[PDB]
Nucleic acid binder design. Structure first.
Length: 116
DNA sequence: AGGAGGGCGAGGGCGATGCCACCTACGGCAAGCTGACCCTGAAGTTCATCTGC
């Protein structure tokens, strides 16, 4: 995804090792270090509300990286909709129930698995 | 000797058996603590172990 100026910016910020060091020397960095599992994200300036992961190329990339990579998986068949719709192992971490986002529907122990 | 030993009918009548108020005051009915430990997870990989080579 080149010529974005949002990800070329961060890819030039993630090939820096010093500006990232400058992130620790920020006014409020001491308050993000307090929260375990802080989630930083990359809003390039000159978009002003829009993250690097909000530009209409990363937006399309994700809409392309959730339409190509998450479509070659196990071909069928949906429990929910019944369509072919490639099957999703690893249901996504439903947040707000547990102490951590937990996979609402998740059969992961040696025998909760039914038929192998 | 042969006596007669009461006969009668009354034995309450009248009303009153309570009046008055009071039957509580006061305040407190809790304090203090705890109400749970412990684990049990998805997901993934490692790592010890097994089978086969």
């Amino acid at each position: 995804l080149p010529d974005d100026a949002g990800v070329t910016a961060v890819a030039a910020f993630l090939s820096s090792a010093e500006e990232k060091s400058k992130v620790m020397q920020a006014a409020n960095w001491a308050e993000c270090a307090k929260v375990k599992g802080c989630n930083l994200s990359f809003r390039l300036v000159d978009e002003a509300v829009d993250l690097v992961c909000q530009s209409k190329a990363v937006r399309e990339y994700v809409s392309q990286a959730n339409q190509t990579q998450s479509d070659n998986a196990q071909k069928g068949i949906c429990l929910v909709t019944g369509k072919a719709a490639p099957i999703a192992r690893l249901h996504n971490a439903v947040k707000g129930v547990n102490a951590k986002p937990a996979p609402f529907a998740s059969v992961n122990l040696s025998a909760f698995e039914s038929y192998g």
